[model samples]
Target: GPGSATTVHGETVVNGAKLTVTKNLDLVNSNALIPNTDFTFKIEPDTTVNEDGNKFKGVALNTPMTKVTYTNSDKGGSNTKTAEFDFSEVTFEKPGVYYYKVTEEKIDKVPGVSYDTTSYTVQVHVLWNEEQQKPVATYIVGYKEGSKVPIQFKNSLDSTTLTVKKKVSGTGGDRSKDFNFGLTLKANQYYKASEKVMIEKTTKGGQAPVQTEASIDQLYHFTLKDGESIKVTNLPVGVDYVVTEDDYKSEKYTTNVEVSPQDGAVKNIAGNSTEQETSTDKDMTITFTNKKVF
Candidate 1:
């Protein structure tokens, strides 16, 4: 969330005025947008990356657009403002040009939602990308109500290696179950942990029915992308893969880590070029550079 906002109007202080803008949809998961795969944040945007590229483990949000702002900031105390964009989605594979516009409007007063006006017109391109290498990387997974969130990781370079670590923070006697550790991913892919449920019963007195309460399920579960899902094969007969919070606390599960992309491809698709001109007849470029001053 952007920082808190305050007023800056000279003498025309507007009250009860508010501003809000947001991604039209949940920001596409770093993995889902790429067809199939659970690659987490810090994973590259290109799905073509294989275990080798992912191995180096570099993913990022390239100058992602921010929630819209109003006459609020750096407008010389001006009351009117505006902001605009031209693309529904922007990708950050390399350096390139972009186009956009903004138009600020102002009004002395309104019937409701009080405020004045200002606008912005902008056209710029953000350049971002770097080379780096690391063994393990983590990302925030789920945040659904009545559910557990996970911190997923991958061994981008080594497909055969898988590591599950849960990151959690709580205080003031308020314990948290948002941490989970159970997801199956490709050697070059990503996975998310899910929460599990545990039921317990307590005896009140002799010959009396037991009382029960449920502790929260803090683990998040996820599977591989596409048709390559995994199963819990070691459960007791007739028992589900579900584990109680007590079991999770006891480290009841283990991941077999290796130093390779275990079960998937390991191909990094960067530094490659496409033949943009298969047939020269179908390619064209137009440029106009005449200036007229008014």
Candidate 2:
């Protein structure tokens, strides 16, 4: 009945009640897919509640009282996840107000995933009505005890992927001739070096596909022959990057660059050593084509 009268137990018994928990994401114009994950919460004692007047008694706060789990596939808008918790075993012998704290445990550290670090308060007031002769309980949950707000937690995935491919053609084009490239990625932000980035490429000296990571203020160098490609992951959205092909400085070869998903806020493709400042709304790809002239 509107956050009250969830149920009234027999004389001196409080059936207590139920509350909801919501999970949300803080998006920064990101196009990354929502990470697959779950969440857990704890119902602990409000140790600071009675600090002023050790007047609170019978501190029998029991945990293991709630469970919350959310699967993947929730995206923008009202697509938040929610769960309910029941204070099923709450029973009181006398009249008093009980307090508790609600919070979540450390979640799996998926790259670009940030967990909510908030602690909320929950109060259950039990009173024995003389005429009714039953214990009725009411609940209060929020950072501010009296304001009935839900216990909500938030998470976010703020990263994307990139792919770069190389091509060479003509009467004397060498598909195995390694071409040099200077790749620089930057985000006016800080991130955990531990946040690993997935990579798929013919590595240096013809090494095959592998993995990598995202870092701030760094230039990555690589060599790719024709018919080979380089793809990287975990680039935080809202970042700027450049992929430049070193000039052969020979009249024997002509170079041109092409960018895909054309017409974005920042997607530039030009010249042999073409400079591109791409925004990661969707994944991006830059292809460098080389033609050899006799």
Quick one: best lDDT, which candidate? 2
Model 1 CA lDDT for position 294? 19
lDDT per model vs. reference: 0.22, 0.63
Candidate topping TM-score: 2
Q: Across residues 66-107, which tens digit of lDDT does each residue of candidate 2 receive?
A: 544443334344547777666545565555666777787775
Clashing pairs in 2: none
- Clash number for each model: 32, 0
What shift in Å separates residue 55 of candidate 1 from its native position after superposition? 33
| Error in Å for residue 238 of model 2 | 0.4
lDDT for each residue of candidate 1 in 80-192, tens digit (9 for 90 to 100): 12222222133434333222222222222111121212122122233343442212111122222334332111111111111212212222111222322242211111111
Per-model TM-score on C-alpha atoms:
0.14, 0.49
Q: Worst ten-residue run, lDDT, model 2? A: 51-60
lDDT of 1: 0.22
